């Protein structure tokens with residue numbers, strides 16, 4: 001798998017080079033997609049490249065002219081990069097209005113980064129009402145219209161259906177990797193598990209698919225493994241920094257499942273059958289479950305996490321809490337209770353892209369790991 | 376007079392709700408810019424968590440509730456109105472301003488998206504019906520036809536839920552009457568609170584607007600509100616003729632203040648501004664609850680709730696502040712950076728640059744919170760206002 005892992009690392013550590021390469025070879029453009037949910041199938045159908053945008057480790061400077069200190073870490077990073085010019089190879093960006101902070105970012109962007117077209121999109125809360133489906137279809141028609149303004153040609157209905165089968169294929173394959181990885185927990189460390197998944201944001205899905213199938217084939221040709229340490233499930237926005245993942249490994253902790261927005265939330269739910277392309281996409285949003293950004297007065301998130309912990313005999317759950325994220329903060333008390341009431345232990349860890357020090361997380365995680373042991 | 380009339384009318388709403396609860400009548404909790412017309416048609420009792428939290432905060436009892444919610448696991452980063460409310464439920468009430476638990480919920484996100492998560496939590500923990508009216512943010516200058524159709528359909532769903540909760544049928548004749556009441560009160564709110572703009576000096580202390588506000592929030596569709604605002608108007612107009620007003624101190628400088636007041640300290644703030652001769656005569660809030668539409672027009676009603684100034688693009692937001700400064704004949708602007716409100720805080724820097732450019736006027740600001748006392752510091756407030764006063768005075772020293 002060495003050749004495959006080297007390929008993945010390359011694009012993840014040098015995304016700008018990968019984007020220019022796609023433009024030179026294909027002669028087509030690239031569009032950025034901001035966190036949680038965008039309709040990638042539409043960009044894909046035009047022959048364009050959908051690039052994921054998830055912040056990064058940076059100090060703040062230019063952003064201080066637009067945000068005060070209490071905006072969430074990830075969005076502080078995204079704005080700084082934007083103002084510094086790091087996204088200039090892109091022909092536009094979709095910034096969905098999922099929360100107060102994403103809404104305010106789009107509005108500042110309009111006057112702060114004039115040269116990169118901002119495409120608006122707001123998902124409905126009443127997502128299960130037939131009237132809500134209709135509204136989202138109109139929102140997606142807007143997105144299609146503005147993508148055509150950019151590229152200079154029509155995006156055909158037949159092609160959107162085609163890109164949808166492609167994306168469902170990729171979702172099925174990632175779910176296959178999740179199971180195999182769980183069966184080879186000693187070989188697949190937290191750093192490798194993250195790389196395999198995250199690399200899917202920086203290439204065409206059809207390419208990523210062939211790569212993961214290869215690795216799956218290589219892994220099944222190896223004996224199943226008896227975990228030598230402790231098993232965990234991670235939940236929250238994201239956990240991709242080298243720092244936090246090395247600490248996990250230092251305590252011989254293995255990640256065998258997740259409820260992270262950057263990871264399994266993306267491929268957990270498929271797009272349904274239909275004759276109308278945009279209708280199929282809209283009904284996907286109706287179907288999503290177990291996420292802090294998807295309206296649900298019953299809060300099924302806790303229950304879904306318990307079911308999965310039981311299936312895989314997992315030893316604990318770690319809340320990876322994005323600094324100053326209000327939706328995740330609102331969820332925390334009720335979700336934690338459903339998990340602990342079932343008998344499963346939990347840990348709190350702050351995620352900060354501007355960190356500086358990490359001795360706190362270090363001591364805390366060591367205690368958790370020891371405790372899981374004596375249990 | 377009007378002062379006492381308005382205060383007595385508020386306490387009456389609370390007393391009516393308790394009486395409703397001890398019998399078999401259902402009571403609701405609602406966000407401050409929800410389509411109240413839909414519940415008044417059923418003669419339902421309805422209360423407002425935002426009003427309660429500001430009220431207990433002014434009596435210095437909010438910190439205790441916040442700390443109860445924080446010990447349950449809720450982060451201090453969350454809105455102070457939300458934490459105060461979480462503590463109230465856990466504590467089983469409070470004594471400085473009590474209110475009964477609800478049997479149903481009414482949520483509209485025109486003011487912000489935090490109320491969505493807040494009300495999700497309440498619905499789950501208490502097992503009660505949540506009524507949701509989703510007004511998605513306007514990026515375009517005009518409300519899209521798709522938004523109009525979506526809201527109207529959501530009006531229908533809300534009515535079906537309310538027939539079940541209340542056990543009564545929707546009455547078209549009665550819907551018309553309520554629409555007429557609401558339309559007159561909207562216009563009386565806008566007229567009365569705009570009077571400071573064209574009067575030198577103003578007939579009232581600017582802070583007074585935030586006491587009157589509670590009435591237009593909790594009883595917008597009621598006849599008693601009509602009669603109360605007519606009384607208030609008579610009084611202000613006479614002040615305009617006699618040179619009287621609730622403002623103590625000489626009105627030397629006229630300003631616009633951005634943001635809602637820090638309730639745990641409002642007493643210190645009033646005395647401090649008057650000390651320096653400062654009074655607020657330009658405001659955006661007269662436009663918050665006007666909510667104008669043509670009677671019997673569903674499309675017009677949808678557009679009105681959609682376009683409350685928290686839910687429109689940054690260009691439009693900016694225009695509101697520009698017009699209030701020029702119309703009020705103001706000498707400067709003073710900004711509240713409110714730790715609770717991300718929606719207002721995360722566009723403040725750009726909005727304040729633009730306004731100063733268009734009008735040529737001086738500005739300054741301070742840090743605080745509407746309900747949590749840990750966020751405000753007297754000394755800072757003092758130094759900041761003094762600095763703005765020195766600049767405004769150097770100006771007229773030239774004129």
Ligand SMILES: CC(C)C[C@@H](O)C(=O)O
Pocket residue numbers: 407408425486635663685745
């Ligand atoms: C913009 C205002 C209506 C918000 C205000 O009521 C509050 O939430 O305190």
Ligand code: SF4
Pocket residue numbers: 035072074075099100101102237322324325326327328
């Ligand atoms: S506040 Fe939370 S959900 Fe919103 S943009 Fe930030 S991390 Fe994402």
Ligand code: SF4
Pocket residue numbers: 454455456486487488489490715716717718
């Ligand atoms: S203070 Fe701001 S965040 Fe809190 S409820 Fe009001 S509008 Fe929403």
Ligand SMILES: [S]
Pocket residue numbers: 035036074237
């Ligand atoms: S996010």
